[PDB]
């Protein structure tokens, strides 16, 4: 649980800062300069550059995004994403990892065999360096008019040590042997315009000099030219530090890589620290040529850099992204359908709430802005929709992405019951009970009082005093129960038999006018420990026919279940 | 609908880039330098500074966050959020806008009158500059031991023109008149230690020289000192450009503001370009002292900067954030209850999917990392949990925030949890789902089920339960005793134990045959109904057999009791 930090403030911590040291294990984590290496770059220039052109985009939604889904794309969902990317204006699209996945293989075959690839589109496929995998990759691409074969191997300090147990020379040979195999296979497949991409995977965890050495060595194998360049893609496989440091690394690589005119320098930033978009934008200013990402940031864990945010961040500062975002709702609908994951309410440009103002003051300012625009428009005999957007609080005209400005004018049962009472209510009980609270805001204490009054407290018509359980020694034997109960205050013996104690008690009640059928049942521990309490929840149809829930809490799994039956009976009556 | 860009490429566009001009109305938008001003800071130092200490945090969840909600927080939700922020270790908390909101006013009264404010916590309240609003703000804070009065007015080029139609002097007067009123009201309430914060609102749309002019003028009125500093909060009310430009602007303000030693320089980034976290981190390196934000990036439009991401971005690089995130799911659940908005599946540190690996090769690399750490710990006679985290693909030990690394396996309308429920009637507890997926990692529905049965259901060695006699006390709270006939590696033996029920009695009975079973959690649910009714039981236990391993067991039987006993046996045999 959360324990308030109580350790001494740092020596020299300002008097106006009363924060205390936490007990989080910070010593298990090192500054980036110590984990990897310090910054090699001198006289950086990216801080002085403002982006004034679109990068070359590559959309990796169909492979890198797809790999990240709990419900992977069906062939129909794949075609719909492919079609969306084509219609938006993307010209490089990663379509699979065909040597690793038969469904990827079959998808690549399908788009090639059906003639589904536009003339200005280059499909891209991922492969590891193993020769049999590169062969299978070329097989999948057979008959493509053009293709990027993207090969990679992990180069990071960490992976060399603990994953590959290999030295720098061995790891570089993995890459150059892979490059040689690609060159061999390309010569065997005529017609196709083969293009190559190499990634030193886990680049952000790799020494820059080494990443440069491996890239250069791979380039020497491929022998690219300005007309037929190679792509070096430098991923933040884990986003390990601040975007300025990533950008410094990009500028250094851009300045130091051999044969630079024949290189397309590509970025592939993940979002582990929340700064993928920033890494991409600063990295582009640092000299990169190309950015790989996904629509709305899909990709493993925190995702790939968001292509929508990057593109509209250009548009909103007067630079054409060369991609159509005129109908962001259509893009969002299609992405949600394809991925089966929602765009968050606050996602830049696309989110439900991003063009909303709930504040009277902000609303008024927005309207003053719109009015001044309309006055300037009327004066210049212009359509206001063609004038410079000048509106407080709205970075863009929502209409320019097909959206609108909105001047907009639950009891928490599950949360409160679990947090304050250690009860995880079955969903249908949550529903059953929250309705009561609606009628009966209700404070946390009031909610509990009502819960106890309905489920826990009642002892009429039925009260269970004590009982004797005669359980079967042998698996599948009969269990008997005799209980002392009160029925509207009148002490009564009941007795029944069944496959277990819960069944036995249910059957015993029938003799006394309660026809009870158990429809569902749940139980959970209420603390750690051998002798911990149990909470039981029983859903039952009760005649003297209403279906109701009951709740029981007790030291024994058995007794909690019996209490839950009594609770249900009393609720039915 | 969507029409493919079809305009010419740019002059100078490389032949290897076939992109075409879109029909997006880019002419309606200008570069930041033209919209606002050129920000040139040739001799900037922030690019060469690595953050080495936590900033002073201020959580604005109860104000900026609250105002951004579809459904504003009820009094109970406000209190729950306040308590969460205090418990995490926040010392400055913006509790509301009491001069503008009666519910905010009543909340501030509540927390003051009920003594909910710790002695190391300073509440902060937002106010506009109208003198009657400032008066109401001080009245809301009546009785507080200390409080920050945060007053603001909009200073942007655009707002001065179209909202106020005012000159620089007029707009500055709004602020200095507010500052004057604050000084007057503070003298009337000598029982409270008053502190001030001024924001030139829409700062990122304001000329830096003007922002400095207005802040300086407000500071001359307030007359702060190093012992009693003023906070100047510089908001990216709209995030207008890239975070390096924001950072340049902060370094410039930090160098140029008058009486800098009497200033706490505060950042308040919004996320309209998706770069708020970056703007905060570069801005802090630029010389800021303080950062305002919200847990999980709640707030106006795209949100305030995420305090959770900023905090754990320090932790994961060896800097103590001075805030406790050791149970991120508790923070998440509380936030979702208060805001009634979900934390997204991919949200840094807290999202559902952020400690998962779906890739086989990543899963293998993770296993190798974990193994190599364990080998190093054994060599050093150290707890692996105390050592340098060295695991590919996982920036932090998920356990350091209360979470668990999860290898996700695809089942060939799928997934392990879903198929187990649909095809076998079992609702696997989440931790069991994770454990079993790791077994599979080390698939077809049949393969999955066969693996599950072999792991949890089939083993009869070392332990097999033959029969048992359960003597349950009749009266509530009485002791249960058990005798059981068991086979231990095939040899039949009798065991005996007592506990608060049959499960506990059985667990205790096993201790005498060299199985130490320490029950951590337990779940049970119905399968089917009537005469065909069964119970599935799940027990999580720390098991030691004559090291300890945390394992799940599963038991299925017609009796709720027998199912639970089967689950204990299952766990023991899994541990072996
Ligand atoms: Cl039963
Ligand atoms: Cl029990
Ligand atoms: Mn990726
Ligand atoms: Mn704000």
Tab-separated table of N, CA and C in Angstrom, chain A residues 402-491:
chain	number	residue	atom	x	y	z
A	402	UNK	N	-12.602	17.863	-38.981
A	402	UNK	CA	-13.920	17.251	-39.074
A	402	UNK	C	-14.671	17.152	-37.751
A	403	UNK	N	-14.172	17.836	-36.715
A	403	UNK	CA	-14.756	17.859	-35.365
A	403	UNK	C	-15.447	19.185	-35.057
A	404	UNK	N	-15.931	19.327	-33.819
A	404	UNK	CA	-16.608	20.564	-33.400
A	404	UNK	C	-16.193	20.991	-31.996
A	405	UNK	N	-16.150	22.304	-31.793
A	405	UNK	CA	-16.046	22.872	-30.453
A	405	UNK	C	-17.325	22.577	-29.663
A	406	UNK	N	-17.141	22.058	-28.452
A	406	UNK	CA	-18.242	21.850	-27.517
A	406	UNK	C	-18.141	22.721	-26.263
A	407	UNK	N	-19.058	23.685	-26.168
A	407	UNK	CA	-19.290	24.465	-24.956
A	407	UNK	C	-20.296	23.710	-24.106
A	408	UNK	N	-19.815	22.753	-23.316
A	408	UNK	CA	-20.721	21.874	-22.578
A	408	UNK	C	-21.176	22.513	-21.262
A	409	UNK	N	-22.500	22.507	-21.065
A	409	UNK	CA	-23.142	23.022	-19.854
A	409	UNK	C	-23.685	21.858	-19.024
A	410	UNK	N	-22.759	8.346	-10.549
A	410	UNK	CA	-22.302	7.059	-10.033
A	410	UNK	C	-21.937	7.162	-8.554
A	411	UNK	N	-22.351	6.150	-7.789
A	411	UNK	CA	-22.095	6.087	-6.351
A	411	UNK	C	-20.670	5.675	-6.007
A	412	UNK	N	-20.031	4.925	-6.908
A	412	UNK	CA	-18.680	4.380	-6.678
A	412	UNK	C	-18.745	3.165	-5.760
A	413	UNK	N	-19.779	2.346	-5.953
A	413	UNK	CA	-20.030	1.201	-5.072
A	413	UNK	C	-18.850	0.232	-5.016
A	414	UNK	N	-18.412	-0.240	-6.179
A	414	UNK	CA	-17.325	-1.201	-6.267
A	414	UNK	C	-16.059	-0.702	-5.584
A	415	UNK	N	-15.683	0.546	-5.876
A	415	UNK	CA	-14.487	1.142	-5.290
A	415	UNK	C	-14.585	1.260	-3.774
A	416	UNK	N	-15.673	1.852	-3.278
A	416	UNK	CA	-15.815	2.069	-1.837
A	416	UNK	C	-15.893	0.746	-1.079
A	417	UNK	N	-16.672	-0.197	-1.592
A	417	UNK	CA	-16.835	-1.482	-0.896
A	417	UNK	C	-15.525	-2.267	-0.824
A	418	UNK	N	-14.727	-2.223	-1.887
A	418	UNK	CA	-13.437	-2.908	-1.882
A	418	UNK	C	-12.422	-2.164	-1.023
A	419	UNK	N	-12.311	-0.856	-1.248
A	419	UNK	CA	-11.287	-0.059	-0.565
A	419	UNK	C	-11.517	0.031	0.943
A	420	UNK	N	-12.744	0.361	1.341
A	420	UNK	CA	-13.054	0.609	2.751
A	420	UNK	C	-13.528	-0.624	3.507
A	421	UNK	N	-13.921	-1.671	2.780
A	421	UNK	CA	-14.547	-2.835	3.437
A	421	UNK	C	-14.007	-4.207	3.027
A	422	UNK	N	-13.116	-4.223	2.043
A	422	UNK	CA	-12.424	-5.452	1.639
A	422	UNK	C	-13.325	-6.413	0.892
A	423	UNK	N	-14.461	-5.896	0.424
A	423	UNK	CA	-15.436	-6.661	-0.331
A	423	UNK	C	-15.354	-6.412	-1.839
A	424	UNK	N	-15.157	-7.495	-2.584
A	424	UNK	CA	-15.221	-7.478	-4.041
A	424	UNK	C	-16.587	-8.014	-4.460
A	425	UNK	N	-17.547	-7.104	-4.636
A	425	UNK	CA	-18.917	-7.502	-4.982
A	425	UNK	C	-18.998	-8.034	-6.411
A	426	UNK	N	-19.637	-9.206	-6.592
A	426	UNK	CA	-19.970	-9.634	-7.961
A	426	UNK	C	-20.678	-8.511	-8.737
A	427	UNK	N	-20.376	-8.389	-10.034
A	427	UNK	CA	-20.911	-7.275	-10.831
A	427	UNK	C	-22.426	-7.077	-10.692
A	428	UNK	N	-23.188	-8.170	-10.757
A	428	UNK	CA	-24.660	-8.117	-10.685
A	428	UNK	C	-25.179	-7.673	-9.321
A	429	UNK	N	-24.423	-7.990	-8.273
A	429	UNK	CA	-24.723	-7.468	-6.953
A	429	UNK	C	-24.426	-5.968	-6.890
A	430	UNK	N	-23.283	-5.555	-7.436
A	430	UNK	CA	-22.956	-4.123	-7.519
A	430	UNK	C	-24.127	-3.332	-8.094
A	431	UNK	N	-24.682	-3.853	-9.188
A	431	UNK	CA	-25.836	-3.279	-9.889
A	431	UNK	C	-27.051	-3.272	-8.964
A	432	UNK	N	-27.418	-4.459	-8.467
A	432	UNK	CA	-28.524	-4.641	-7.522
A	432	UNK	C	-28.465	-3.631	-6.368
A	433	UNK	N	-27.272	-3.428	-5.809
A	433	UNK	CA	-27.082	-2.551	-4.648
A	433	UNK	C	-26.969	-1.053	-4.958
A	434	UNK	N	-26.302	-0.694	-6.056
A	434	UNK	CA	-26.120	0.726	-6.394
A	434	UNK	C	-27.460	1.422	-6.658
A	435	UNK	N	-28.421	0.659	-7.185
A	435	UNK	CA	-29.791	1.134	-7.398
A	435	UNK	C	-30.447	1.592	-6.088
A	436	UNK	N	-30.219	0.828	-5.017
A	436	UNK	CA	-30.664	1.178	-3.666
A	436	UNK	C	-30.067	2.518	-3.223
A	437	UNK	N	-28.760	2.675	-3.432
A	437	UNK	CA	-28.035	3.903	-3.089
A	437	UNK	C	-28.555	5.118	-3.866
A	438	UNK	N	-28.889	4.910	-5.141
A	438	UNK	CA	-29.492	5.954	-5.972
A	438	UNK	C	-30.718	6.553	-5.267
A	439	UNK	N	-31.645	5.683	-4.864
A	439	UNK	CA	-32.822	6.080	-4.091
A	439	UNK	C	-32.443	6.680	-2.726
A	440	UNK	N	-31.674	5.926	-1.934
A	440	UNK	CA	-31.274	6.335	-0.583
A	440	UNK	C	-30.370	7.559	-0.606
A	441	UNK	N	-25.352	13.293	-2.384
A	441	UNK	CA	-24.793	11.955	-2.556
A	441	UNK	C	-24.824	11.196	-1.229
A	442	UNK	N	-24.859	9.865	-1.327
A	442	UNK	CA	-24.679	9.005	-0.166
A	442	UNK	C	-23.181	8.971	0.148
A	443	UNK	N	-22.820	9.287	1.392
A	443	UNK	CA	-21.420	9.246	1.835
A	443	UNK	C	-20.924	7.796	1.955
A	444	UNK	N	-19.592	7.577	1.893
A	444	UNK	CA	-19.073	6.221	2.119
A	444	UNK	C	-19.677	5.520	3.348
A	445	UNK	N	-19.755	6.219	4.485
A	445	UNK	CA	-20.303	5.642	5.729
A	445	UNK	C	-21.797	5.330	5.601
A	446	UNK	N	-22.542	6.216	4.935
A	446	UNK	CA	-23.961	5.992	4.646
A	446	UNK	C	-24.179	4.788	3.743
A	447	UNK	N	-23.309	4.634	2.745
A	447	UNK	CA	-23.363	3.497	1.827
A	447	UNK	C	-23.203	2.185	2.584
A	448	UNK	N	-22.196	2.127	3.446
A	448	UNK	CA	-21.946	0.939	4.245
A	448	UNK	C	-23.136	0.626	5.178
A	449	UNK	N	-23.613	1.642	5.896
A	449	UNK	CA	-24.790	1.491	6.761
A	449	UNK	C	-25.950	0.859	6.010
A	450	UNK	N	-26.184	1.311	4.780
A	450	UNK	CA	-27.244	0.761	3.943
A	450	UNK	C	-26.931	-0.676	3.513
A	451	UNK	N	-25.664	-0.938	3.195
A	451	UNK	CA	-25.252	-2.292	2.819
A	451	UNK	C	-25.510	-3.282	3.953
A	452	UNK	N	-25.065	-2.928	5.156
A	452	UNK	CA	-25.262	-3.760	6.339
A	452	UNK	C	-26.747	-3.990	6.644
A	453	UNK	N	-27.558	-2.942	6.468
A	453	UNK	CA	-28.994	-3.006	6.761
A	453	UNK	C	-29.728	-3.949	5.822
A	454	UNK	N	-29.302	-3.985	4.562
A	454	UNK	CA	-29.926	-4.857	3.575
A	454	UNK	C	-29.435	-6.306	3.601
A	455	UNK	N	-28.122	-6.496	3.712
A	455	UNK	CA	-27.531	-7.825	3.511
A	455	UNK	C	-27.063	-8.531	4.779
A	456	UNK	N	-26.636	-7.762	5.778
A	456	UNK	CA	-25.921	-8.341	6.913
A	456	UNK	C	-26.753	-8.413	8.195
A	457	UNK	N	-27.523	-7.361	8.459
A	457	UNK	CA	-28.237	-7.223	9.737
A	457	UNK	C	-29.525	-8.055	9.916
A	458	UNK	N	-30.362	-8.193	8.857
A	458	UNK	CA	-31.689	-8.797	9.050
A	458	UNK	C	-31.641	-10.218	9.623
A	459	UNK	N	-32.540	-10.473	10.578
A	459	UNK	CA	-32.644	-11.777	11.246
A	459	UNK	C	-34.085	-12.309	11.182
A	460	UNK	N	-34.929	-11.620	10.408
A	460	UNK	CA	-36.289	-12.074	10.102
A	460	UNK	C	-36.539	-11.977	8.588
A	461	UNK	N	-37.307	-12.928	8.013
A	461	UNK	CA	-37.921	-14.083	8.701
A	461	UNK	C	-36.951	-15.154	9.209
A	462	UNK	N	-35.723	-15.189	8.684
A	462	UNK	CA	-34.781	-16.286	9.002
A	462	UNK	C	-33.553	-15.847	9.817
A	463	UNK	N	-33.299	-16.544	10.927
A	463	UNK	CA	-32.054	-16.379	11.690
A	463	UNK	C	-31.391	-17.738	11.880
A	464	UNK	N	-30.084	-17.824	11.616
A	464	UNK	CA	-29.334	-19.055	11.807
A	464	UNK	C	-28.523	-18.932	13.093
A	465	UNK	N	-28.849	-19.789	14.062
A	465	UNK	CA	-28.230	-19.755	15.382
A	465	UNK	C	-26.915	-20.533	15.386
A	466	UNK	N	-26.994	-21.817	15.052
A	466	UNK	CA	-25.821	-22.686	14.945
A	466	UNK	C	-26.189	-23.892	14.086
A	467	UNK	N	-25.204	-24.700	13.738
A	467	UNK	CA	-25.472	-25.870	12.918
A	467	UNK	C	-24.399	-26.912	13.097
A	468	UNK	N	-24.758	-28.158	12.798
A	468	UNK	CA	-23.800	-29.241	12.797
A	468	UNK	C	-23.645	-29.823	11.404
A	469	UNK	N	-22.407	-29.808	10.910
A	469	UNK	CA	-22.075	-30.304	9.573
A	469	UNK	C	-21.419	-31.678	9.666
A	470	UNK	N	-22.080	-32.653	9.066
A	470	UNK	CA	-21.565	-34.017	8.969
A	470	UNK	C	-21.086	-34.207	7.526
A	471	UNK	N	-19.826	-33.851	7.277
A	471	UNK	CA	-19.246	-33.927	5.936
A	471	UNK	C	-18.822	-35.358	5.602
A	472	UNK	N	-18.878	-35.705	4.323
A	472	UNK	CA	-18.482	-37.035	3.887
A	472	UNK	C	-16.969	-37.131	3.920
A	473	UNK	N	-16.450	-38.196	4.528
A	473	UNK	CA	-15.007	-38.424	4.548
A	473	UNK	C	-14.454	-38.593	3.137
A	474	UNK	N	-15.216	-39.300	2.306
A	474	UNK	CA	-14.788	-39.686	0.972
A	474	UNK	C	-15.302	-38.727	-0.095
A	475	UNK	N	-14.450	-38.442	-1.078
A	475	UNK	CA	-14.827	-37.615	-2.227
A	475	UNK	C	-16.120	-38.143	-2.851
A	476	UNK	N	-17.079	-37.250	-3.064
A	476	UNK	CA	-18.355	-37.642	-3.672
A	476	UNK	C	-19.355	-38.333	-2.754
A	477	UNK	N	-19.024	-38.448	-1.467
A	477	UNK	CA	-19.986	-38.911	-0.456
A	477	UNK	C	-20.984	-37.812	-0.120
A	478	UNK	N	-21.990	-38.144	0.688
A	478	UNK	CA	-23.055	-37.200	1.062
A	478	UNK	C	-22.658	-36.344	2.281
A	479	UNK	N	-23.044	-35.072	2.261
A	479	UNK	CA	-22.876	-34.188	3.414
A	479	UNK	C	-24.251	-33.895	4.009
A	480	UNK	N	-24.343	-34.008	5.334
A	480	UNK	CA	-25.570	-33.722	6.072
A	480	UNK	C	-25.381	-32.495	6.954
A	481	UNK	N	-26.479	-31.797	7.222
A	481	UNK	CA	-26.471	-30.679	8.161
A	481	UNK	C	-27.723	-30.726	9.040
A	482	UNK	N	-27.563	-30.347	10.302
A	482	UNK	CA	-28.695	-30.050	11.169
A	482	UNK	C	-28.446	-28.653	11.695
A	483	UNK	N	-29.439	-27.789	11.578
A	483	UNK	CA	-29.285	-26.428	12.052
A	483	UNK	C	-30.407	-26.038	12.987
A	484	UNK	N	-30.051	-25.217	13.972
A	484	UNK	CA	-31.015	-24.523	14.809
A	484	UNK	C	-31.207	-23.147	14.196
A	485	UNK	N	-32.445	-22.860	13.795
A	485	UNK	CA	-32.804	-21.582	13.179
A	485	UNK	C	-33.997	-20.985	13.905
A	486	UNK	N	-34.246	-19.698	13.686
A	486	UNK	CA	-35.528	-19.132	14.076
A	486	UNK	C	-36.277	-18.644	12.852
A	487	UNK	N	-37.561	-18.964	12.809
A	487	UNK	CA	-38.445	-18.507	11.749
A	487	UNK	C	-39.439	-17.556	12.361
A	488	UNK	N	-39.264	-16.271	12.049
A	488	UNK	CA	-40.002	-15.187	12.704
A	488	UNK	C	-39.985	-15.324	14.227
A	489	UNK	N	-38.777	-15.526	14.749
A	489	UNK	CA	-38.549	-15.614	16.176
A	489	UNK	C	-38.746	-16.986	16.797
A	490	UNK	N	-39.322	-17.927	16.049
A	490	UNK	CA	-39.638	-19.253	16.589
A	490	UNK	C	-38.520	-20.250	16.329
A	491	UNK	N	-37.896	-20.746	17.399
A	491	UNK	CA	-36.792	-21.701	17.259
A	491	UNK	C	-37.239	-23.021	16.637
